[PDB]
């Protein structure tokens, strides 16, 4: 199941403050075509977060979330 | 009337024939941070299409829509 080809994602800057976990709904890479290197977070009330991949409690977030 | 933050849409990749006009709902230009300079045009369908600034059909196209 491909999906539809459209407009690129970009994170050109990461929030500053660490997201509560329990308002993470789902999270998904960045591509490397982009500026630079990016997780966007998406919320229960859908709201888009860029985060930076290399900070510790992202990288906890997304194990979390796959691991479950 | 501000718009909540969020990725940026980012072209990188240009469609290379012509959309049939009949097709466009609306247009917006991808921000400059951007790898490429772009156009997403906005269809009936809501599919979005990333276009060449540059090519004249665009250019038509976002006159068009600017103008009425």
Request: hydrophobic share 50%; net charge neutral.
């Given at each position: 199941s491909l999906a539809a080809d459209t407009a690129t994602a970009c994170c050109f800057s990461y929030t500053s403050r660490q997201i509560?976990?329990?308002?993470?709904?789902d999270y998904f890479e960045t591509s490397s075509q982009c500026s630079k290197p990016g997780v966007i977070f998406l919320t229960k009330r859908s709201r888009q977060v860029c985060a930076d991949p290399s900070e510790e409690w992202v990288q906890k977030y997304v194990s979390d979330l796959e691991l479950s």
């Open positions: 509560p976990q329990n308002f993470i709904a």
